[PDB]
Design a protein around this ligand. Structure first.
Ligand SMILES: O=C(O)C1=NO[C@H]2CN[C@H](C(=O)O)[C@@H]12
Ligand SMILES: O=C(O)C1=NO[C@H]2CN[C@H](C(=O)O)[C@@H]12
Ligand SMILES: [Cl-]
Ligand SMILES: [Cl-]
Lengths: 254, 255
């Protein structure tokens, strides 16, 4: 009756609490996803045990078709729920059962302020400004699988040179934008979090696609629909809005 | 191979009667965003469909006894397999039918005339000279009726006062009311985009006061819900949904 909740460390969704003493259990973590899990447990009346995904990954396929990360943790029934910024994608939805999105978003561009670049097209036209994304993320997979002309050109550019334009994680990409002439294709929510923490950065263009974060469950989970209903209840009460406002308030950049 | 029954409703630009020099029959009678959507979804899933207009012409709401009407009831009673329409995903509805994931995200916002000091819903709750309201018994109204936020509670009181004189029957009547008088219509953002592209004196005020989506409705336990979700995600990543919305929403330009 105690659910196992797989998750992953990512600001401001799930983070280690800064503590002067050792912490244990769910008390180790804080962030948007912990508040969310608290509200969901309050609505549905279940106990949860938060476990970090061992390989520290969200979930992707290799050439052989095998999965990793939280997705694999759900497929193998080693976790009941996955409460994380887990992007709802076509390939993932076929192997796990997502709840309806608790947060909508889209891919956009993270770049430094004061440049003539205003769209993804302006990036696809030139090569002086390097651009890319995190390796093996849904953002990257969009460009890898996209058949749109512009995004095909951008994908070609990212792949050339042994994938030198891709970064391993979000932090590395942000530092590459702040140090060099680089633009990071990133999900809009993370961009909102960053541009309010470091005022040298801004979002370029709008959203190139629309998607959402959903709570992951294994196929056939009786909790998928109940969690969908709980998320809708929390959205109509305005509680999700309060949680995002709580965790996205930072330095306040002009 | 059975032909699925698709309940729907007449609403611009989702489902509309074609203009024709001759009588039309079957699915050939209708056109709009939702028909294109059905065409692509069948193209992916390979099912035949038969479009039926919901008899009572309503989306779906509860009465005093808790009984449903509209497309929602049509799905509950299994007189239809799918409901392809701008059917807002709500808490109360999700408990009686199985929604697919949203094929279009949106939120409640304000439709008003341009060049006014009003910039938010708060500016409306502060005053009473500018009357404001919503469509009767729609999800937008129910938001304010059930909301526990101070501002939206005040707004709901305003809408309800005077035997609900601030509420409109349908979207068209409300739009005409904004175009003729000093009235602001609380409306879903997608429809507002549809209006502001065709009436250049009008605009959206503020942002979205909440977040929701339109989903394809199916009865609880429907084996088609998950496959339709997957098809919708496939269509979003290919940019098909974006192209369809662009097709039916851009109506020339406002200079
Ligand atoms: O791809 C991106 O932009 C991502 N950044 O962090 C993760 C949040 N959701 C995405 C996923 O599930 O793959 C990952
Ligand atoms: O509430 C609104 O703004 C609405 N306008 O038309 C309908 C579209 N979805 C809502 C519903 O499902 O009730 C209705
Ligand atoms: Cl769903
Ligand atoms: Cl409702």
């Amino acid at each position: 009756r105690t659910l196992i909740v797989t998750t992953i460390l990512e600001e401001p969704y799930v983070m280690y609490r800064k503590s002067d003493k050792p912490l244990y259990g769910n008390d180790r973590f804080e962030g948007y996803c912990l508040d969310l899990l608290k509200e969901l447990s309050n609505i549905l009346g279940f106990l949860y045990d938060v476990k970090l995904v061992p390989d520290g990954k969200y979930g992707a396929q290799n050439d052989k078709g095998e999965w990793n990360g939280m997705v694999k943790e759900l497929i193998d029934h080693r976790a009941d729920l996955a409460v994380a910024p887990l992007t709802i994608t076509y390939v993932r939805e076929k192997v796990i059962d997502f709840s309806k999105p608790f947060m909508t978003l889209g891919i956009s561009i993270l770049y430094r302020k004061g440049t003539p670049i205003d769209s993804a097209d302006d990036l696809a036209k030139q090569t002086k400004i390097e651009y890319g994304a995190v390796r093996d993320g849904s953002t990257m997979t969009f460009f890898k699988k996209s058949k749109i002309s512009t995004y095909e050109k951008m994908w070609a550019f990212m792949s050339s040179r042994q994938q030198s334009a891709l970064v391993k994680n979000s932090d590395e990409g942000i530092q590459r934008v702040l140090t060099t002439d680089y633009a990071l294709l990133m999900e809009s929510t993370s961009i909102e979090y960053v541009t309010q923490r470091n005022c040298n950065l801004t979002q370029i263009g709008g959203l190139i696609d629309s998607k959402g974060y959903g709570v992951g469950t294994p196929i056939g989970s009786p909790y998928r629909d109940k969690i969908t209903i709980a998320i809708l209840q929390l959205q109509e009460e305005g509680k999700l809005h309060m949680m995002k406002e709580k965790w996205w308030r930072g330095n306040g950049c002009p």
